[PDB]
Design a protein around this motif. Structure first.
Motif, short mmCIF file in Angstrom:
data_model
loop_
_atom_site.label_atom_id
_atom_site.label_comp_id
_atom_site.label_asym_id
_atom_site.label_seq_id
_atom_site.Cartn_x
_atom_site.Cartn_y
_atom_site.Cartn_z
N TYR B 37 -21.44 -18.72 6.10
CA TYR B 37 -22.69 -18.83 6.84
C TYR B 37 -23.29 -17.45 7.05
O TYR B 37 -22.59 -16.50 7.38
CB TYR B 37 -22.45 -19.52 8.19
N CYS B 38 -24.60 -17.35 6.83
CA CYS B 38 -25.26 -16.07 6.97
C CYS B 38 -26.60 -16.25 7.68
O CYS B 38 -27.28 -17.26 7.48
CB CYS B 38 -25.46 -15.39 5.61
N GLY B 39 -26.94 -15.28 8.50
CA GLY B 39 -28.16 -15.34 9.28
C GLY B 39 -27.94 -14.72 10.65
O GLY B 39 -26.89 -14.18 10.95
N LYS B 40 -28.98 -14.84 11.48
CA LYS B 40 -28.95 -14.21 12.80
C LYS B 40 -28.05 -14.99 13.76
O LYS B 40 -27.11 -14.43 14.34
CB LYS B 40 -30.36 -14.10 13.36
N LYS B 41 -28.32 -16.28 13.93
CA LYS B 41 -27.62 -17.10 14.91
C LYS B 41 -26.45 -17.86 14.30
O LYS B 41 -26.10 -18.95 14.77
CB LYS B 41 -28.60 -18.05 15.60
N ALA B 42 -25.82 -17.30 13.27
CA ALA B 42 -24.64 -17.92 12.68
C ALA B 42 -23.44 -17.76 13.61
O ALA B 42 -23.28 -16.73 14.28
CB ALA B 42 -24.33 -17.29 11.32
N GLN B 43 -22.59 -18.78 13.66
CA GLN B 43 -21.44 -18.77 14.54
C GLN B 43 -20.37 -17.84 13.99
O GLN B 43 -20.10 -17.83 12.78
CB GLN B 43 -20.90 -20.19 14.72
N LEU B 44 -19.77 -17.06 14.87
CA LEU B 44 -18.92 -15.94 14.46
C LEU B 44 -17.56 -16.46 14.00
O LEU B 44 -16.76 -16.93 14.81
CB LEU B 44 -18.78 -14.95 15.62
N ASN B 45 -17.30 -16.36 12.70
CA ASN B 45 -16.00 -16.64 12.11
C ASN B 45 -15.73 -15.61 11.03
O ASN B 45 -16.61 -14.84 10.65
CB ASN B 45 -15.93 -18.06 11.53
N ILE B 46 -14.50 -15.61 10.53
CA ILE B 46 -14.11 -14.65 9.50
C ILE B 46 -14.74 -15.07 8.18
O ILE B 46 -14.47 -16.15 7.66
CB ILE B 46 -12.59 -14.55 9.38
N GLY B 47 -15.59 -14.20 7.63
CA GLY B 47 -16.30 -14.47 6.40
C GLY B 47 -17.79 -14.65 6.57
O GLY B 47 -18.50 -14.70 5.56
N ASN B 48 -18.28 -14.75 7.80
CA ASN B 48 -19.70 -14.97 8.06
C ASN B 48 -20.38 -13.65 8.38
O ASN B 48 -19.94 -12.93 9.29
CB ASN B 48 -19.89 -15.96 9.21
N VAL B 49 -21.44 -13.33 7.65
CA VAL B 49 -22.19 -12.10 7.85
C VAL B 49 -23.39 -12.38 8.77
O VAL B 49 -24.12 -13.36 8.57
CB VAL B 49 -22.61 -11.47 6.50
N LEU B 50 -23.54 -11.56 9.80
CA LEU B 50 -24.55 -11.72 10.82
C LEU B 50 -24.89 -10.34 11.38
O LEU B 50 -24.04 -9.44 11.31
CB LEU B 50 -24.07 -12.68 11.92
#
Ligand SMILES: [Mg+2]
Ligand SMILES: [Mg+2]
Ligand SMILES: [Mg+2]
Ligand SMILES: [Mg+2]
Ligand SMILES: [Mg+2]
Ligand SMILES: [Mg+2]
Ligand SMILES: [Mg+2]
Ligand SMILES: [Mg+2]
Ligand SMILES: [Mg+2]
Ligand SMILES: [Mg+2]
Ligand SMILES: [Mg+2]
Ligand SMILES: [Mg+2]
Ligand SMILES: [Mg+2]
Ligand SMILES: [Mg+2]
Ligand SMILES: [Mg+2]
Ligand SMILES: [Mg+2]
Ligand SMILES: [Mg+2]
Ligand SMILES: [Mg+2]
Ligand SMILES: [Mg+2]
Ligand SMILES: [Mg+2]
Ligand SMILES: [Mg+2]
Ligand SMILES: [Mg+2]
Ligand SMILES: [Mg+2]
Ligand SMILES: [Mg+2]
Ligand SMILES: [Mg+2]
Ligand SMILES: [Mg+2]
Ligand SMILES: [Mg+2]
Ligand SMILES: [Mg+2]
Ligand SMILES: [Mg+2]
Ligand SMILES: [Mg+2]
Ligand SMILES: [Mg+2]
Ligand SMILES: [Mg+2]
Ligand SMILES: [Mg+2]
Ligand SMILES: [Mg+2]
Ligand SMILES: [Mg+2]
Ligand SMILES: [Mg+2]
Ligand SMILES: [Mg+2]
Ligand SMILES: [Mg+2]
Ligand SMILES: [Mg+2]
Ligand SMILES: [Mg+2]
Ligand SMILES: [Mg+2]
Ligand SMILES: [Mg+2]
Ligand SMILES: [Mg+2]
Ligand SMILES: [Mg+2]
Ligand SMILES: [Mg+2]
Ligand SMILES: [Mg+2]
Ligand SMILES: [Mg+2]
Ligand SMILES: [Mg+2]
Ligand SMILES: [Zn+2]
Lengths: 120, 50, 69, 91, 114
Positions: B37-50
């Motif tokens: 998941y990528c974007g501003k309000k993406a939920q914070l997990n390992i692998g997600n760029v925000l």
RNA sequence: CCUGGGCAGGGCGAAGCCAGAGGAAACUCUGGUGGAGGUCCGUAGCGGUCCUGACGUGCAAAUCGGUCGUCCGACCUGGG
RNA sequence: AGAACUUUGAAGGCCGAAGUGGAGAAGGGUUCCAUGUGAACAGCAGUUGAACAUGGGUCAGUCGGUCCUGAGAGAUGGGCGAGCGCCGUUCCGAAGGGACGGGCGAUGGCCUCCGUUGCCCUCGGCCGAUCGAAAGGGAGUCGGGUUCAGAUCCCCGAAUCCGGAGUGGCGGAGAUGGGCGCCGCGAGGCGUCCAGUGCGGUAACGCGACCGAUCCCGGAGAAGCCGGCGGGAGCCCCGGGGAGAGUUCUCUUUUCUUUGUGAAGGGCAGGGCGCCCUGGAAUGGGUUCGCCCCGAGAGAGGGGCCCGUGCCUUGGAAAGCGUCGCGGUUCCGGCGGCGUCCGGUGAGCUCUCGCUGGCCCUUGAAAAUCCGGGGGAGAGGGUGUAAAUCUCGCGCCGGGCCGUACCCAUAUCCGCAGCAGGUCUCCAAGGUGAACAGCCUCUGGCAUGUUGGAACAAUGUAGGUAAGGGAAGUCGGCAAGCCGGAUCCGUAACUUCGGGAUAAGGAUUGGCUCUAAGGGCUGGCAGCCGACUUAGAACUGGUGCGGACCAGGGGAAUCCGA
């Protein structure tokens, strides 16, 4: 060439002095193991598919052939005969004990039926 | 020449119908099929760029 | 080349035009009939000499026949 | 039979490159050549790909792991800190 | 005992010079040229690997010869999926669409009750 | 850097795996199996230690004969 | 005219499949072939040659270049530079001239019906023109014969690829069914309605075809090295048959050569599957050389698919080969007969295919081309009439250009030369032997490498010996020589515990006879058929046995460099 090949077939010119390579070079130990173990593992298949060895002893003697225990086909067949003769004794003595227990429990159940008829 | 693993993450283009393939640096513990998941309000997990 | 199994299929192909060569080759056990129509070679092999004789009788006489020895 | 007593997997090298270096390479060679339990299919088919990449034989789910183990303990500490900062005070 | 010889001017044992040897009807061993093997199409990027079944595994320039029976399977997603992907994607699409309908009607009930 | 080609046979016997034995346990021992390695003898190949050998107006403006080092690789090599 | 050297017969040798053989890439450019001369060159010579003079020889849709990108080289836009020019390859660029569909206009052809041209709407990342492999990728030709020189090119025979079809060459699919009412004994006919862009198998999937546009997705192309193991072919081995030839002093059913199916299409073996259904397992089970596999479905049973380079079949026996006989001065790929067969096995060698494993701070290339799938915008006959399309069987036409000889080498290349130098590859037989080691033979080549005759002096260059001593010579065991292969015992100091180690040190090794053990296939334990290995024993040869060849002297230490 044919006379010398016939002499090698009879077993001549094969002494210690006329060997120029090692034993692994002459007859490889891996090839000896492959031939030996393929024969000792398909004789069990020809026994199991026809009549001789059942499902449970096949895996045990399979792992015992995989281990370096059974030298050749003759003592493999003799060990299978020994296990079959042991299994026959172990089932015969168990059948004798089961027959004794079955007759004892049958007499007990029939006398229990007689006393039940005496009660009612 | 790189000891870090490359990650081939395909995206969807919201403008013209075409699947865009990109090349992320593979984070630790990510696996194939995991939704990145990528974007501003993406939920914070390992692998997600925000 | 192609091997024709039926008699009528080879017969219709022999009556089919643009087929310029028909070869008859006898043998010690059978007999082969060859049509070189266009870029293919069609073979009817048959072992009955009476059937070969009646097929030679029913062969169209407008087309040339070459015998192989 | 226990053929070697101290060298283990490092006996493929021999007499070269030092006892302490061979002892330090022993544990991580066992770590890179050992099979690991796949967390998805439950099997032991995690084979090492190129450095950092682990690959399970069944179900083909390639995972990015450590360089010499399946999970670095520092990376597990990072994962615990990430879930703590996730469920701490709603980001 | 008859030693055989190249026919082209390709004196090196390259990948294109991958040959065999046969016997002529004139009683002579000849050096015949073998076309390289063509592999069947395979998994579509994520499933267990294996060449797709029912496809004549030739070169794609031989796929111009190959007709519309020996290049695909009559199922939809025939020549691209090994049908395990088909039976997975059908059930996956159906389950995710039905769960989105369930989430939509649950949000509609939440809007009605709130 | 790209693109291709090649490297006879043997010796040592790593991890893993099987079977058996000892012990209370921890664990240990034995026979196979396996084929690991900038591993050993050695051919082709690549270089050239010594005889300071042969030539030394030679075959050659640097070569030849033995004796050599290495030969699954930090290996040799064609073309661009 | 003239022979140690030219040619042929014969005899003896070498190269001995890692060649002194059969062909190539680069390089040479006529050296390739035939005829004639031998002054000239070949280090002597020539009747000979790669010399000289004359005349010939290279035939391609399917062999390669041409197409594509690789590392890279490069022009425009742009920037820099006094300047020929230089930098750079997407950077700061208005860097697509293409196309589906629709509408309007005009022209032409049989204005039936189609084909062009102009305008408008709509669509359209090129990772940027272009070059860059005669070993990378790259569709499709093989069998026989032919000349003094050609060969997959020429002749015969047999196939395949790529483009072409407007008045749409012939078929076959699409495609022709169901219901109602009337007549007719019935077969059938009529009026009307509806459907028809294919079927079958539960399945994995199969067939003679199976409407498909912008767009999207995927695969092929497209992958390292090294072990292993199995299948297939070729070659080799053995037994029997057939044809020819050698030895016969004596024996030898003996010894030597040969004993065939190309591309393409069909059928059938064999191999493989991480491909499906039934079915649920533990007393865990099935299989490998090693592994490995199983409740996310093992064993078992029944199926499906891929490669089928293997066998048979059309090709294909009329050719080809062996042998015997007959006609033409010759020319006729002459004429006639017979055969071109049955089997077995492999730690056998090479190639190929398939499975599996190991190695890695090494992950082992792209593009040109081609295919499938999702999407349904659109197209067509609409009825007792036949279309829209075909990746199906056929038929017709074309495939332009360039190279094709020869050497590929101790004599056609380079090194001033017919120079013990150097230069990249494929094919590989029999025996001894572990071996593609060394030695001797077979197919195939050769005259001993720019000379011959006579004798065997000194000195020299290479090879071998020598009574007794064994390094006393020499700066130094320099050179040379001892052990050397294999089997069975036994192995020290030290140590990073892996090694040292073939440590060191002993015994045997020949010939000829036996004995024992290690296998396969059939029947409800018994009987048939073959491979080379190990161990033991007897007899005997002048202590002789790795009988040639193949081939580690060892130990104790010091310094330096792991
Ligand atoms: Mg072994
Ligand atoms: Mg090529
Ligand atoms: Mg080494
Ligand atoms: Mg050593
Ligand atoms: Mg040495
Ligand atoms: Mg040198
Ligand atoms: Mg030298
Ligand atoms: Mg000197
Ligand atoms: Mg001198
Ligand atoms: Mg050497
Ligand atoms: Mg040496
Ligand atoms: Mg070495
Ligand atoms: Mg001479
Ligand atoms: Mg002569
Ligand atoms: Mg040669
Ligand atoms: Mg000449
Ligand atoms: Mg002269
Ligand atoms: Mg003359
Ligand atoms: Mg001249
Ligand atoms: Mg032609
Ligand atoms: Mg070509
Ligand atoms: Mg420039
Ligand atoms: Mg400019
Ligand atoms: Mg180009
Ligand atoms: Mg020629
Ligand atoms: Mg030919
Ligand atoms: Mg065509
Ligand atoms: Mg094989
Ligand atoms: Mg074979
Ligand atoms: Mg064939
Ligand atoms: Mg030629
Ligand atoms: Mg030379
Ligand atoms: Mg030379
Ligand atoms: Mg041999
Ligand atoms: Mg032998
Ligand atoms: Mg070779
Ligand atoms: Mg010479
Ligand atoms: Mg002496
Ligand atoms: Mg003496
Ligand atoms: Mg002495
Ligand atoms: Mg002394
Ligand atoms: Mg001195
Ligand atoms: Mg010396
Ligand atoms: Mg002596
Ligand atoms: Mg001492
Ligand atoms: Mg030592
Ligand atoms: Mg000291
Ligand atoms: Mg050093
Ligand atoms: Zn898994």
């Amino acid at each position: 060439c044919r006379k010398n090949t016939l002499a090698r077939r009879k077993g001549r010119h094969m002494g210690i002095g006329k060997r120029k390579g090692t034993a692994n070079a002459r007859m490889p130990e891996k090839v000896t193991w492959m031939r030996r173990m393929r024969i000792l593992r398909r004789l069990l298949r020809r026994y199991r598919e026809s009549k001789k060895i059942d499902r449970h002893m096949y895996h045990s003697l399979y792992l015992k052939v995989k281990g370096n225990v059974f030298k050749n086909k003759r003592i493999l067949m003799e060990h299978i005969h020994k296990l079959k003769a042991d299994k026959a004794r172990k089932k015969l003595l168990a059948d004798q004990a089961e027959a004794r227990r079955s007759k004892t429990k049958e007499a007990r159940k029939r006398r229990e039926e007689r006393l039940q008829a005496k009660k009612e | 020449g790189r000891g870090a693993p490359l990650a081939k993450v395909v995206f969807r283009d919201p403008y013209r119908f075409k699947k865009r393939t990109e090349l992320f640096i593979a984070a630790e513990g990510i696996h194939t099929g995991q939704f990145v998941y990528c974007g501003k309000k993406a939920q914070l997990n390992i692998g997600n760029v925000l | 080349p192609r091997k024709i199994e039926e008699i009528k299929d080879f017969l219709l192909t022999a009556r089919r035009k643009d087929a310029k060569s028909v070869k008859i080759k006898k043998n010690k056990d059978n007999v082969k009939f060859k049509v070189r129509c266009s870029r293919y070679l069609y073979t009817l092999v048959i072992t009955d000499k009476e059937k070969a004789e009646k097929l030679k009788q029913s062969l169209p006489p407008g087309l040339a026949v070459k015998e192989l020895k | 039979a226990k053929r070697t007593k101290k060298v283990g997997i490092v006996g493929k090298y021999g007499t070269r490159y030092g006892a302490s270096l061979r002892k330090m390479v022993k544990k991580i060679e066992i770590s890179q050549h050992a099979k690991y339990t796949c967390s998805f299919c439950g099997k032991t088919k995690m084979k090492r790909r190129a450095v950092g990449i682990w690959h399970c034989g069944s179900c083909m789910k390639t995972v990015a792991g450590g360089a010499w183990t399946y999970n670095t303990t520092s990376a597990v500490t990072v994962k615990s800190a990430i879930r703590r900062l996730k469920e701490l005070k709603d980001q | 005992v008859q030693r055989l010889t190249y026919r082209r001017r390709l004196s090196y044992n390259t990948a294109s010079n991958k040959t065999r040897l046969s016997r002529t009807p004139g009683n002579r061993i000849v050096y015949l040229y073998t076309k390289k093997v063509g592999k069947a199409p395979k998994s579509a990027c994520g499933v267990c690997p294996g060449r797709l079944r029912g496809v004549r595994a030739v070169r794609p320039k031989v796929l111009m010869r190959l007709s519309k029976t020996k290049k695909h399977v009559s199922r939809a997603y025939g020549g691209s999926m090994c049908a395990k992907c088909v039976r997975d994607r059908i059930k996956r699409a159906f389950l995710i669409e039905e769960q989105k309908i369930v989430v939509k009607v649950l949000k509609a009930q939440a809007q009605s009750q709130k």
